[PDB]
Amino acid sequence: AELTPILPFLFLGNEQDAQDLDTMQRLNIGYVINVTTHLPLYHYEKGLFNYKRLPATDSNKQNLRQYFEEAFEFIEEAHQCGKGLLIHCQAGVSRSATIVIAYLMKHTRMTMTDAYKFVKGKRPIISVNLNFMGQLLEFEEDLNNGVT
Ligand SMILES: CSc1scc2c1-c1nc(SCC(=O)C(C)(C)C)ncc1CC2
């Protein structure tokens, strides 16, 4: 169980990272984003956290752009309320790391490459997915022209 802290309040993890309840409470995590279609929302009935499911598959066909704004408003909410947010998908964090990078691109005005450099430096293992990479590329261009 190794929840990588990207920002003071924003943590990246995987399938098993999201089940270490004690770890989540030590870190004052109040919000969880589960970026799968099929994994359960872990610890839902213990009513301790606010959840958001981004029902996405790890393919070269899945669109994630659609989930970006939804996910940023929920990270902003964990920040405005002084709590931490965990975002996880499965092994290799393809889906969840795509979203973290997009957040760092909009709400830190980092570049694409520089966000990836930054995340991979805190979490070494990241599966490649050129579909998501290409979608981050057009997100970067929609930001530099101000369509967001
Ligand atoms: C924005 S990713 C990026 S930008 C420039 C490069 C890369 C890169 N990424 C990955 S893995 C991560 C992914 O595919 C994501 C799911 C996060 C989109 N492996 C190799 C490279 C080579 C150079």
Q: Is 62 within 8 Å of 56 (Cβ atoms)?
A: yes
Q: Which atom of ligand 1 is nearest to the CA of 129?
A: 14
Which of the residues 56, 89, 93, 101 is marked catalytic?
89
Full DSSP string of 50-87: EEEE----SSSS---GGGHHHHHHHHHHHHHTT-EEEE
Selection from 48, 40, 52, 39 nearest residue 21 by Cα? 48
Strand 50-53 versus strand 10-13 pairing type: unpaired
| Experimental technique for the deposited model | X-ray
The matching CATH number, chosen from 3.40.109.10, 3.40.50.300, 3.90.190.10, 3.30.9.10, for 4-144 is 3.90.190.10
Question: What resolution in angstroms does the PDB record give?
Answer: 3.0
Per DSSP, 146 falls in state: T
Q: How many other C-beta atoms are found inside a 10 Å radius of the C-beta of residue 100?
A: 26
CA 96 → CA 53, 88, 144, 146, distances in Å? 11, 5, 23, 24
Q: How many CA atoms lie within 13 A of 73 on its CB side?
A: 6
Token digits of residue 139: 């997100």
From ligand 1's centre to the CA of 133, what distance in Å? 6
